From Swiss-Prot:
The gene is BTN3A1. N-glycosylated. This is Butyrophilin subfamily 3 member A1. The chain holds residues 328 to 512 of 513 of the full protein. One of its GO terms (biological process) is positive regulation of cytokine production. It comes from the Eukaryota.
């Protein structure tokens, strides 16, 4: 459809790989650096400054300061996940709420069927079908972050007219221990 035919004409396809140095020690980054899973217990890793030590988050290796970009994430049959972008300057040590005011622009799924935007307050999304693959789209200049069902091209959510100042990283978060991973499409 139009989604497939037009996406690269309008947005530059980002080749996003996960940065193991940023991943919470309870997270496992795959060898090919496209997939993330959760461990039963935290691994023994350094608390280097780049690492999220409280939030179960991991970042992409590269950030954006301009232009239009997109990447796709296979969420599959996961019951829980949150993806989007965050500012380079987010608090990585300890806890703050993942909201736009704290530099996080994400949406996702909890409890198998509760789709929401991580905002203050959180807003519930009504999706006609559960997405298996999600397209994340960034237009830095217009300040739009948009999410689409990457299979049927249907709209999921758009953060509108954000005045971005900082560089933006792709961000990924998983809380649950389940057999299906969260995977970036190349
Ligand atoms: C406290 C907990 C789940 C709630 C996570 P949270 O309070 O940051 O809520 P969220 O950021 O998913 O809207 C147990 O992992």
């Amino acid at each position: 459809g139009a989604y497939n035919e037009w996406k690269k004409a309008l947005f530059k396809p980002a080749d996003v790989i996960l940065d193991p140095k940023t991943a919470d020690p309870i997270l496992l980054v795959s060898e090919d650096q496209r997939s993330v899973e959760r461990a039963k217990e935290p691994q023994d890793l350094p608390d280097n400054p780049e690492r999220f030590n409280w939030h179960y988050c991991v970042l992409g290796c590269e950030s954006f300061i301009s232009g239009r970009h997109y990447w796709e994430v296979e969420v599959g049959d996961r019951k829980e996940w949150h993806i989007g972008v965050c500012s380079k300057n987010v608090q990585r040590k300890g806890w703050v709420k993942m909201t736009p005011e704290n530099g996080f622009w994400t949406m996702g799924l909890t409890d198998g069927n509760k789709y929401r935007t991580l905002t203050e307050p959180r807003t519930n999304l009504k999706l006609p079908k559960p997405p298996k693959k999600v397209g994340v789209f960034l237009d830095y200049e217009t300040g739009d972050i948009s999410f689409y069902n990457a299979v049927d091209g249907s709209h999921i959510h758009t953060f509108l007219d954000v005045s971005f100042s900082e560089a933006l990283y792709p961000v990924f978060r998983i809380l649950t221990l389940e057999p299906t991973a969260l995977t970036i499409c190349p």
